[PDB]
């Protein structure tokens, strides 16, 4: 019964909730587990950049968020074409193609091609046979600059 | 302080393992300290007890210097019987009083190939530990 004055409340507790009560006592344990999984993954791909491929710049798709920009799923085939690389060697290098994204604006197209060309200039490529450098790089950069990048490959800012 | 996460410090777990430990682990439990001259001739601080080794008692009612020979290791009851560590029950007969191997001290080893080998292993391990902590 309502006492004097208050909200009309509707608690959704009519449905045998305390079998499907879910607790979070394993939250520190799963944080430790994810942390050591990230560490294991990084030292497995030890020279590769520790977080995944480079992601593109992506405009958020609503009049609430279409002033901001964020990392997207992947680069598209048109801007891969203008960058001048093949859509399979791109994923072997670390570029994260996404084929189903379109480009309806040359400004976003040119921004992502410039970003792609910048990454390609920034990339150090190891040779296949280390005694026989076919077309990869010179041993100077291969020795001094073989360091793992932590965090996202070049991040997306507003 | 213990830090190894796989070894427990639970009192009930430690008591349970101590009480139903198997026989070779019970032997390792029922190890006993050596005398100082024995330690000096060897380099070993303690030793698992044996059937036919002389020993003397340092605690309790039968404390003394009488070097009695061990006659029984009752690992079931975690006790040992020595030659003259006895009491006379009502019948006039005598029974061995059992005491603890952590409350005796070994004065002469029943020596054979395996005991020379394990004394060598213990002394060698203490020597490698000393040269490491040089």
């Amino acid at each position: 019964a309502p006492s004097r004055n208050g909200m009309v409340l509707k608690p959704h507790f009519h449905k045998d909730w305390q079998r499907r009560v879910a607790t979070w006592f394993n939250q520190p344990a799963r944080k430790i587990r994810r942390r050591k999984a990230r560490q294991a993954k990084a030292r497995r791909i030890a020279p590769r950049p520790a977080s995944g491929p480079i992601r593109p710049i992506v405009r958020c798709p609503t009049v609430r968020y279409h002033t901001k920009v964020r990392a997207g799923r992947g680069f598209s085939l048109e801007e891969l074409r203008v960058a001048g690389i093949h859509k399979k060697v791109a994923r072997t290098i670390g570029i994260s193609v996404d084929p189903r994204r379109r480009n309806k604006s040359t400004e976003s197209l040119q921004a992502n091609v410039q970003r792609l060309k910048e990454y390609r200039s920034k990339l150090i490529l190891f040779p296949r046979k280390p005694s026989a450098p076919k077309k990869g790089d010179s041993s100077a950069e291969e020795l001094k600059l073989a360091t793992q990048l932590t965090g996202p490959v070049m991040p997306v800012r507003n | 302080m213990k830090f190894n996460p796989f070894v427990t410090s639970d009192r009930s777990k430690n008591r349970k393992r101590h009480f139903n430990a198997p026989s070779h682990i019970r032997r390792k439990i029922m190890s006993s300290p050596l005398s100082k001259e024995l330690r000096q001739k060897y380099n070993v601080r303690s030793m698992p007890i044996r059937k036919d080794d002389e020993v003397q008692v340092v605690r309790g009612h039968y404390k003394g210097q009488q070097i009695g020979k061990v006659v029984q290791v009752y690992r079931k009851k975690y006790v040992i019987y020595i030659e003259r560590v006895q009491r006379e029950k009502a019948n006039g007969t005598t029974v061995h009083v059992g005491i603890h191997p952590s409350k005796v001290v070994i004065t002469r080893l029943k020596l054979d190939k395996d005991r020379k080998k394990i004394l060598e292993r213990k002394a060698k391990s203490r020597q490698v530990g000393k040269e490491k902590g040089k």
Binding site: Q18, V21, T23, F25 | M1, S9, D10, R11
Partner: protein
């Protein structure tokens, strides 16, 4: 408790024509349990009243500003000498109670030289008080793995660990702290402020960048500055015997006027 405790029975409530209480009784007929009362908080073998659940809200979140507030308060109280003494820390031959040392002690490696440092620094009476304080607990904690209890000793608050934890860590009562990550549960052990602390020079210099002065903010907390005082001079005796207050007062009434007897 277990969610099935007291409820794996199948007891029925036996009607009301029989001259027994209407509690649910164990159904059967061949054992002691047969016809005994079940399910109730008052029955032997039933379930407790309101069985405790795991989703009991064990944890409590505190505002970061208040946790930092509590840290700053405990640090100031550690600086004050009467408050450390009042925790009972045996500081009488210590010189300069905010006690700061070199970094060779951060480079220490052995318990012998750590104990020697504490003897030379005159904290060994606090350590001996801890040793004398070691005794058994009273109650069920002994069965529940807390046999032995003892006092708290000083904290060592370092900046780098080059063996200092291992050089310590065996002397009883000694808590190592690492100034960058500071814990109120170890700076105010019972909820009481005033624990004895020994600092290194690197940690003692890092403090002023960890929490900032008032003229500048902290450089390692980003948005944090020290809380302000509500009373800048906490000296009531000085303020009340100051001549301005004394000039503004009136004269005291020190004559007690007890009840007259009505003749």
């Amino acid at each position: 408790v277990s969610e099935l405790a007291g409820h794996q029975t199948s007891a029925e409530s036996w009607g009301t024509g029989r001259a027994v209480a209407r509690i649910p009784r164990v159904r059967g007929g061949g054992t002691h349990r047969s016809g005994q009362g079940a399910f109730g908080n008052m029955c032997r073998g039933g379930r407790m009243f309101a069985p405790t659940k795991t989703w009991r809200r064990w944890h409590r979140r505190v505002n970061t500003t208040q946790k930092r507030y509590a840290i700053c308060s405990a640090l100031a109280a550690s600086a004050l000498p009467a408050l450390v003494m009042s925790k009972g820390h045996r500081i009488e031959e210590v010189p300069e109670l905010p006690l700061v040392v070199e970094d060779k002690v951060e480079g220490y490696k052995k318990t012998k030289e750590a104990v020697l440092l504490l003897k030379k620094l005159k904290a060994w009476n606090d350590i001996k008080k801890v040793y004398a304080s070691q005794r058994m607990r009273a109650g069920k904690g002994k069965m529940r793995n807390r046999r032995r209890i003892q006092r708290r000793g000083p904290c060592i608050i370092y900046n780098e660990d080059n063996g200092i934890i291992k050089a310590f860590r065996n002397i009883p009562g000694i808590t190592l702290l690492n100034v960058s990550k500071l814990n109120i549960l170890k700076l105010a052990p019972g909820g009481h402020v005033g624990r004895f602390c020994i600092w290194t020079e690197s940690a003692f210099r890092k403090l002023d960048e960890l929490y900032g002065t008032w003229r500048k903010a902290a450089s390692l907390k980003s948005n944090y500055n020290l809380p302000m005082h509500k009373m800048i001079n906490t000296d009531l005796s000085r303020i009340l015997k100051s001549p301005e207050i004394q000039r503004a007062l009136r004269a005291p009434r020190k004559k007690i006027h007890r009840r007259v007897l009505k003749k």
